[PDB]
């Protein structure tokens, strides 16, 4: 697999994922990654992005997710189904997302990572998501709506 849930007391409180050869876990999600090979790597902190990262082992470097900074208007998908990307924010229908979906990546129509969801905001019709994405120049940025809560 490519997504590795993070377990603290035998329950999943977030998910680790492997993108482009780096293992990304939310910084606010405490626990052990549900793996044996990827759990042994020391992780570097990226608290400005509320993430931690490390190098993928040699045997896992090829079986990882690719990502893109190209985000044309339209529909994107993730574990729970479709995601709307409009007005520069990723949003899901009310109640679709919630606590525990921390580190879950959002995929395009080709299965490429466009953002990593860290939290969200419940709006009138859809929940806005706090994500780590790549801007128009491909540089890592923290894309969050006003009042987002860690999931």
């Amino acid at each position: 697999d490519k997504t590795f849930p993070i377990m603290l007391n035998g329950q999943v409180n977030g998910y680790a994922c492997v993108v482009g050869g780096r293992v990304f876990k939310p910084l606010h999600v405490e626990g052990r990654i549900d793996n044996e090979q990827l759990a042994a790597i020391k992780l570097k902190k990226a608290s400005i992005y509320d993430l931690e990262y490390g190098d993928v082992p040699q045997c896992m470097k090829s079986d990882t997710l690719q990502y893109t900074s190209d985000k044309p208007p339209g529909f994107y998908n993730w574990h729970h189904g479709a995601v709307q990307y409009e007005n520069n924010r990723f949003t899901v229908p009310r109640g679709v997302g919630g606590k525990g979906d921390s580190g879950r990546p959002i995929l395009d129509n080709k299965g490429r990572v466009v953002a990593i969801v860290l939290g969200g905001v419940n709006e009138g019709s859809r929940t806005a998501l706090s994500v780590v994405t790549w801007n128009q120049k491909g540089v890592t940025v923290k894309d969050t709506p006003e009042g987002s809560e860690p999931w």
Partner: protein, 49 residues
């Protein structure tokens, strides 16, 4: 002695030069770190916007 001593009476120009270099060097180094700290935060802000 006819004259009177003071704290700075015995400090030569060479000693003042070393004091100025020491104090100026350390202060400039800290200021360099603070300017770098301010600029990186400004650069990161522009990444978001």
């Amino acid at each position: 002695a006819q004259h009177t001593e003071s704290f700075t009476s015995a400090i030569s120009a060479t000693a003042w030069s070393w004091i100025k270099v020491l104090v100026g060097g350390t202060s400039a180094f800290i200021v360099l770190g603070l300017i770098a700290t301010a600029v990186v935060a400004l650069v990161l802000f522009f990444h978001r916007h």
